Symmetry: D2
Subunit: 359 residues, 4 copies
């Protein structure tokens, strides 16, 4: 199956009972047992397993070429359960440019649980080897990062984590399974902030986790059931529904990203454009070796904070909001960050250009 | 407002915009900002705050006479966030008869995070005083417990936790806010497995947390945002919808519970009926002093495991399932445990009696 | 064999035979796979024709009304439209004089162009029904108790009249609900509901329901529903199933407050007339009590004028000034003269609902 | 000023002005509080009359079709019913000869009793339309391209004919979608859709949509919708809004596969005739290309007989044997002769959809 056919028929998204071509929304909490312990189709309690949630988990497991899938109530919940794979005294290595909520949870919550953290500039693989302490048990890397889009070598990070006995995790939210598959590069666990691209319509807060390891999946299934950060059935369906058009959406976003960047590099009011597609970008060639596409998040710099406030008000199609990966374009100041939507490419380039022209 | 009027108009369950008499389902992830940092109605990101989730949080805060509410993706998620209020080395005291999932999360997950646990027979308040270590920081009690319905003195446990400087938590799932208000008895934090009675229709997996403490609410809001165990908007609405009939449902369940127990105590095939309403029940008078009602979970003993298997098959209205607090009656063997539904009282008594008669 | 409260929980099929789920799965779908051409896995081919979630609520209303076939529509008016479509050009319908405004609107502004000629009759006296039967009469439609004056019509006699003259008897059982009044058991052919009112019960679903035991009329209704497509969505179908579960407890609480609220209205000096079937002096009070074992939560009363009715509504705290009825929250409205107020008793505390309306009437 | 792909994202009102939410809130409600009697906070009083979530999808289809007023119905047939109700007893309707089966069913088995007399015409030759106009003719209904043979009718000429003879022109634009064909811009009075097909796009919503710029006809449609209640639920309204967001990318991918799939069908020896407007030899191929800048994803072709059509469907791997069309997944069916197969090209990979149908046709 090619990529666009996998997004439609990958996993189990139909009902074998009635033949429904979409997954039924099992808004239920419990299931009848014919005999004591005799499950009709393997469901006993919705927290342990829910057929609508099991559908979206089989979709992300296929899109990432994994064996097991896990749906959580948010991208932060999916990252929490992954960190709970370690005990008191264990050490984690993350990239210095992690997303803010990851920095918060690990430095404010899990440090209170004995988990020691150390943020490392992973753009140079040599800095990962040296920081590995005897208690180091995990390697967590996002690529490209937020909001400067720093690229980390996934393959080398996997070989590093393997040699030193580390659980390799990759936050693949920005790249999506359509352009990047960390599991195929040796990574143990891959997770996504499903609120971003997989949902794609700014209407689901969710997280997904995929892995080919039976152990880590067994330990993750126990953590999910024992911590209950599960995704609801309604949100699970809308996630499946939005994933169906993931390929078409990313290709339209990729087409606009190319044209928008060309505009940003030539404007006199824009210094420092940040995106892995730019040639002068650090680790640019590494990104192309591990990905066959590009993310829709772009970051550029204006003169000062007042110019960024003026640029946003002059736009007509960019929505001032705090997410990314939507069908509608989003803009925010973490330096300005934009999440390219699926509007007309000529309209998005012209709207941002005429807004920058007013500076 | 009396109890039945509070369940309808307590909290904020209407739309001030359109005037809609029910809370809109905000299936959304982000919100437009008029200016940088200028929130229209105080919403910026659905994980931090969602209007549908804020509605159900204001309902549970009012029903428990609390000041702040928190909705989580499951009852286990609500209990996890409460445990994350403590750091490495802190100690918790729980009742020896806690629910299984609470035993799992604390002994298999949080012990790996330095949190030391000790389960204590809380039915005698003297056993709580002696176990308080210098590192003890929390007192967690369910009353009545699962599945033997052991009653713990809430008021005395609150005075104990206050004197020794402890965060008092009460799992009020079985009693619901309609019959028991732990906050009114001095308890710091109250939580519920909203999957049970508050939802009431076996279609929402959720947890709720209420507290009158501004500190603990601030620390809980940070934990919820930093761990992302949030409840979805669709599940939040169905929770609000089911809570509307909580009073009518509990009163029907209470009427049947009285008649079912009278039947169970007189049947020759039933030894040892467990419920706080029985006079010979341990701490029976304590339960009536802290609650003006009764739970619908009843536990009784048959001769052996084969008689329990036979009793379940002979029933017609009791559903063999793994939850509780549903409109439909539920039965399970953890000794048999039944969750009384809202069916006709004469039908539920007769159905269970004719099934026990076959033993 | 099941009592009413148990029938509301286990009546019909509201579980999943596949996974075992204790609630009806929401089949948000449009079409269904066929293993072989013409072979349906479980009898579904297109959601408009049949949907598993809609089929659940259809079996519920069929069991609650002691009928064989149930039909769910997009709204109460859609259920009335589909029933009126049972008739041909030139046919005649007899309706009660004070039928709901929307039905009056549909029958006199839309279906008068179908060729159906409508007649509105004081059905409280069954003789007026016999006197109005024209040769080309084919259907008898009656609302009991009506809106907003709650006039009571003899259902059993109306069924015998329709049978005697070969008419299709239809009863709008919205106000009474299947928990208190079963027209099908009294000889009526078709019973319909505005599920927006009490069956939904939480003021969050706009739906219509139809039930009948006649196989011929059911096939004709299934054809019209598929040929006109006023079907109910799967999400609304499930919420309707969910709300029906608490129907008995909701009505029993509403009836308790109805008794105390009426007593307050009869003793207040700013209230003149009170309209409700439970009142002994109400016309056909014995008829209602013989065909129903309960009372609706809609009450109509009169104040001095329109300014008094306006000030009353602003003086209440638990009565929501809005349309619709039968919700868990109490509703108030002014529909028929200026001073005629109409309330929909919710499930709030009885003492709170009586004290709030009593003090509000006292600022007059 | 917006291009098509930007219009699909920001056209109409699909945000919450209150909280600022970037999507339409699902107003699962039935009634609305009134501060003062008759004072509406935001113009809502009863969900059947108007619902905020339904009003969102109504403004979407009105903007996509360059119309002023939009209406959402419970299904595509409900949208057709409400439009046919615009006419009175005795009025006449002219429809294309190969109109959809459900419309044929509704117009010849239900509305023939309304007093409406229906006429089915070969609208591919506009002269047949003029020849059929009776004195009592009031409406012109046309499907282009039709189903399943995809016959193309001149929309611009059909609008001039309706205007010349004082008829209400209606175009079923389901197959073409507003992304490729805008009948209102060509002089048509009313355009309707079966949103179950492409607008929803994910085979999970049964809905109908109507759009018009005529103020008089819009008030008449709003009245019929309220007086018959075939409205769309709030949950289905939102999913319809959500699915429309990706309409352009879905159709553009469907069209790319349509080009390659047709070329394969024209060169396969087990395939005789292929029916699609893009084919140069197709009747009125120049007409379609002049009134639309795209192509539908429904393709019709012929195999040797019925056994060959049965074996073909069992031989595919990505084509789902089911009803409906326009979904993200490819669909197949056998409707008109035995060997006539009808496919609905999905958004799967073009190479995968061409190779899967090519190898399946090769086992014949
Ligand atoms: C790379 C990455 N990881 C994790 C997350 C968090 O997953 P959730 O589903 O949102 O829980 C985000 C979303 N961060 C968003 C929102 C940031 C905020 O609300 O403060 C973003 O970067 O715009 C993310 O972009
Ligand atoms: C007292 C109590 N606390 C916490 C929970 C768990 O909250 P959740 O919403 O389910 O996450 C339950 C539910 N326990 C259920 C289910 C037990 C099981 O599935 O193994 C019960 O006791 O039947 C409970 O009864
Ligand atoms: C007896 C009766 N029949 C039919 C209907 C209409 O069914 P729907 O589900 O609302 O389509 C109503 C609702 N009448 C409501 C609505 C009033 C209005 O819409 O203006 C009422 O009278 O309060 C009704 O009370
Ligand atoms: C052109 C056209 N008009 C109207 C409709 C009906 O609108 P609904 O939303 O389905 O109510 C359809 C769907 N025709 C489908 C359905 C076939 C069937 O129901 O048997 C089709 O032909 O595949 C259609 O293709």
């Amino acid at each position: 199956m090619n990529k666009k056919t996998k997004l439609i028929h990958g996993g189990h998204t139909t009902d074998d009972y009635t033949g429904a071509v979409t997954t039924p929304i099992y808004q239920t909490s419990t299931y009848l047992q014919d005999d004591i312990g005799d499950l009709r189709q393997g469901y006993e309690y919705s927290r342990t397993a829910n057929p609508t949630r099991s559908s979206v988990e089989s979709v992300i497991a296929a899109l990432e070429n994994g064996k097991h899938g896990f749906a959580f109530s948010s991208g932060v919940a999916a990252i929490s359960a992954v960190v709970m794979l370690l005990d008191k005294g264990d050490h984690i290595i993350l990239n210095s440019d992690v997303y803010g909520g990851t920095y918060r949870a690990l430095t404010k919550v899990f440090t209170r649980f004995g988990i020691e953290v150390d943020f490392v500039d992973t753009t140079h693989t040599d800095s990962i080897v040296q920081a590995i302490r005897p208690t180091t048990k995990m390697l967590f890397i996002e690529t490209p990062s937020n909001p400067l889009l720093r690229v980390t070598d996934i393959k080398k990070s996997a070989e590093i984590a393997k040699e030193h006995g580390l659980i390799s995790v990759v936050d693949n939210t920005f790249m999506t399974p359509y352009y990047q598959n960390p599991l195929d590069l040796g990574i143990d666990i891959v997770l996504h902030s499903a609120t971003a691209y997989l949902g794609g319509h700014s209407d689901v807060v969710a997280g997904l986790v995929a892995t080919s390891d039976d152990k880590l999946a067994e330990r993750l299934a126990f953590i999910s059931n024992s911590t209950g950060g599960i995704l609801g059935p309604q949100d699970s369906y809308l996630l499946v529904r939005g994933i169906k058009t993931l390929g078409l959406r990313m290709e339209q976003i990729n087409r606009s990203v190319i044209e928008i960047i060309k505009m940003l590099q030539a404007h006199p009011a824009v210094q420092q454009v940040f995106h892995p597609s730019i040639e002068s970008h650090l680790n640019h060639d590494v990104h192309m070796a591990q990905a066959d596409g590009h993310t829709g998040v772009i970051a550029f710099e204006v003169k000062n904070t007042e110019s960024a406030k003026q640029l946003i008000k002059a736009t007509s199609y960019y929505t001032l909001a705090e997410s990314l990966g939507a069908v509608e374009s989003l803009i925010s100041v973490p330096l300005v960050r934009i999440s390219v939507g699926i509007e007309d490419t000529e309209d998005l380039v012209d709207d941002l250009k005429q807004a920058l022209d007013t500076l």
